Design an enzyme around this catalytic site. Structure first.
Site, mmCIF file in Angstrom:
data_model
loop_
_atom_site.group_PDB
_atom_site.id
_atom_site.type_symbol
_atom_site.label_atom_id
_atom_site.label_comp_id
_atom_site.label_asym_id
_atom_site.label_seq_id
_atom_site.Cartn_x
_atom_site.Cartn_y
_atom_site.Cartn_z
ATOM 1 N NE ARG A 236 -0.347 0.713 4.819
ATOM 2 C CZ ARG A 236 -0.182 2.027 4.971
ATOM 3 N NH1 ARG A 236 -0.710 2.867 4.087
ATOM 4 N NH2 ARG A 236 0.508 2.507 6.000
ATOM 5 C CB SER A 269 -0.532 -4.196 2.856
ATOM 6 O OG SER A 269 -1.424 -3.659 3.821
ATOM 7 N NE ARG A 291 -3.936 -7.956 11.510
ATOM 8 C CZ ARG A 291 -3.090 -7.256 12.264
ATOM 9 N NH1 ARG A 291 -3.321 -7.152 13.577
ATOM 10 N NH2 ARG A 291 -2.071 -6.571 11.693
ATOM 11 N N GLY A 320 1.906 -11.010 8.602
ATOM 12 C CA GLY A 320 3.276 -11.121 9.069
ATOM 13 C C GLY A 320 3.612 -12.564 9.436
ATOM 14 C CB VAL A 369 7.155 -8.830 10.957
ATOM 15 C CG1 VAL A 369 5.773 -8.468 10.500
ATOM 16 C CG2 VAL A 369 7.340 -8.354 12.384
ATOM 17 C CD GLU A 385 5.577 -6.489 16.595
ATOM 18 O OE1 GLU A 385 4.389 -6.906 16.583
ATOM 19 O OE2 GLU A 385 5.933 -5.358 16.152
ATOM 20 C CG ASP A 389 5.070 0.722 18.958
ATOM 21 O OD1 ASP A 389 4.170 1.587 18.862
ATOM 22 O OD2 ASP A 389 6.208 0.961 19.429
ATOM 23 C CG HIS A 393 2.096 -1.840 11.262
ATOM 24 N ND1 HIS A 393 1.478 -2.142 10.067
ATOM 25 C CD2 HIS A 393 1.778 -2.844 12.113
ATOM 26 C CE1 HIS A 393 0.815 -3.278 10.191
ATOM 27 N NE2 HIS A 393 0.979 -3.726 11.422
ATOM 28 C CD1 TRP A 431 8.941 -4.895 12.121
ATOM 29 C CD2 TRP A 431 7.154 -4.698 10.789
ATOM 30 N NE1 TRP A 431 7.833 -4.750 12.922
ATOM 31 C CE2 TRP A 431 6.725 -4.632 12.124
ATOM 32 C CE3 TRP A 431 6.200 -4.595 9.773
ATOM 33 C CZ2 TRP A 431 5.385 -4.461 12.469
ATOM 34 C CZ3 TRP A 431 4.870 -4.431 10.120
ATOM 35 C CH2 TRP A 431 4.478 -4.359 11.454
#
EC number: 4.8.1.5
Length: 470
Positions: A236, A269, A291, A320, A369, A385, A389, A393, A431
């Site tokens: 995206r 994405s 999701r 992920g 990820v 991860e 967070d 993201h 990531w």
């Protein structure tokens, strides 16, 4: 072995059980909010070593968790927190994972931070208690018997690189590795360039292009190589606009919009991707609204999308996650659904159906990820991860650093990290754009880029080379 930092508020009387041969039994006494009371019973030679208690018991009691003699602790997962508005953080929750796959309590989302004492074998504890547990560490001993022998190499780089980013995509074609898309500042796609890396030169450059170049520069994008043609899906831009399904003939250096968004599989994405010589696979990830747990295949010969059977509740929607074709089958490994997940699943093409698999033995704590490649019967994963967070993201989250391989034929996980050698093992990250790759005549894992624990970006190119025995 190796002492690991105790994690928690640094108020209290420090205690240290020291290091033993193994752990026979765990004692946990709950407090009113968090953890009151711990005690361990160890074994050293032919000697049962009952340990001192740390903290004080509560009217709740103390629950026992015995570890079989043919069996040991691979990790301790937990939650520390500053509660009461009291001067120190204390430890509020614990889970124990066993080599045989016993697990004491299922992890749950509790506020506070998650930590984890991880890696192959917990051989002793230490922490800090003030009549209740305030912080905890342990000692890990990495197992020396590494089945999938190999080493980590920090590949050198020269040209106009894709440089510092994450949430991008990589693939190999011949002795050249191609990169695309990605982000540097939170949620801001950089370019539309297709960067290319000459292995023998160890040098970067922008690929030339023709034809239907991707309409939007983007992040959260994926791509895999089939033959000499690259295949690219999703991602995206800033405005939550989505890319369709393109391809790039590397000998021909020409782009090609294979199927438009709104024509093919749900625009999304941070999905996952793979290929098997005949089809290109797209799983999960985040659509405009939800999701997903769906998987779609796209036959090159028949030039056409097929929608695969849907797993339903068994396998929760996620992004992920790792997706690799382990053998003839598609493998979904771990991922994120609001919580980080350590599911494992395979999809059988022939049957068009899904199977869940139990896994064991020095397994990774749940995570998203991460870097992943399938080589042989193995899936290899690095970092990832281990906790989202708060800000999205947007913020770093908590990121780890283990190296793990799943043996699909035995369902034994192993940690490829050694005490023994000297090597350039990558620092904790997530990531990353990752792939399976051959470099200087060794196949293995190609980590690139990624988010730092400090919300920075990386630019390193990393390679777990599987030494020759194979």
């Amino acid at each position: 072995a190796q002492k690991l930092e105790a994690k928690g508020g640094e108020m209290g009387d420090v205690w240290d059980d020291g290091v033993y041969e193994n752990v026979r039994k765990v004692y946990v006494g709950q407090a009113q909010y968090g953890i009151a009371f711990v005690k361990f019973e160890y074994v050293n030679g032919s000697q049962v070593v009952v340990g001192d208690e740390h903290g004080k018991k509560t009217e709740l009691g103390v629950e026992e968790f015995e570890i079989d003699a043919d069996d040991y602790i691979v990790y301790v997962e937990g939650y520390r927190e500053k509660v009461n508005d009291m001067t120190s953080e204390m430890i509020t929750f614990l889970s124990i994972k066993t080599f045989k796959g016993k697990t004491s309590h299922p992890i749950e989302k509790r506020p506070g931070v998650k930590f984890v004492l991880h890696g192959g074998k917990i051989v002793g504890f230490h922490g800090r208690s003030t009549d209740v547990l305030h912080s905890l560490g342990a000692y890990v001993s990495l197992s020396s018997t590494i089945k999938l022998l190999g080493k980590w190499i920090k590949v050198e780089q020269k040209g106009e690189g894709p440089g510092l980013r994450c949430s991008h995509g990589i693939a190999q074609v011949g002795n050249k590795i191609y990169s695309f898309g990605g982000e540097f500042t939170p949620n801001q796609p950089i370019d539309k360039h297709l960067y290319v890396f000459d292995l023998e030169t160890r040098t970067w450059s922008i690929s030339p292009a023709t034809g239907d170049v991707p309409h939007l520069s983007c992040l959260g994008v994926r791509m895999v190589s089939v033959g000499s043609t690259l295949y690219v899906f999703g991602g995206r831009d800033a405005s939550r606009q989505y890319n369709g399904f393109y391809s790039f003939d590397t000998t021909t250096n020409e782009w090609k919009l294979l199927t438009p968004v709104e024509e093919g599989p749900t625009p999304r994405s941070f999905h996952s991707m793979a290929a098997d010589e005949e089809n290109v696979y797209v799983f999960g990830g985040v659509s405009a609204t939800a999701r997903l747990n769906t998987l779609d295949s796209y036959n090159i010969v028949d030039k056409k999308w097929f929608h695969c059977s849907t797993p339903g509740d068994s396998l929760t929607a996620r992004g992920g996650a790792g997706l690799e074709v382990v053998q003839g089958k598609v493998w979904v490994v771990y991922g994120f659904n609001g919580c980080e997940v350590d599911d494992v699943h395979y999809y059988d093409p022939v049957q068009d159906k899904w199977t869940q698999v139990e896994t064991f033995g020095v397994r990774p704590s749940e995570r998203s990820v991460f870097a992943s490649a399938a080589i042989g019967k193995h899936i290899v994963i690095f970092g990832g991860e281990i906790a989202m967070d708060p800000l999205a993201h947007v913020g770093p989250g908590q990121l780890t650093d283990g190296t793990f391989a799943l043996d699909t034929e035995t369902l034994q996980w192993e940690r490829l990290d050694k005490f023994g050698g000297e090597e350039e093992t990558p620092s904790s990250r997530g990531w990353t754009a990752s792939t399976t790759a051959t470099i200087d005549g060794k196949k293995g894992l190609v980590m690139h880029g990624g988010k730092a624990p400090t919300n920075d970006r990386f630019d390193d190119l990393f390679f777990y080379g599987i030494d020759s025995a194979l």
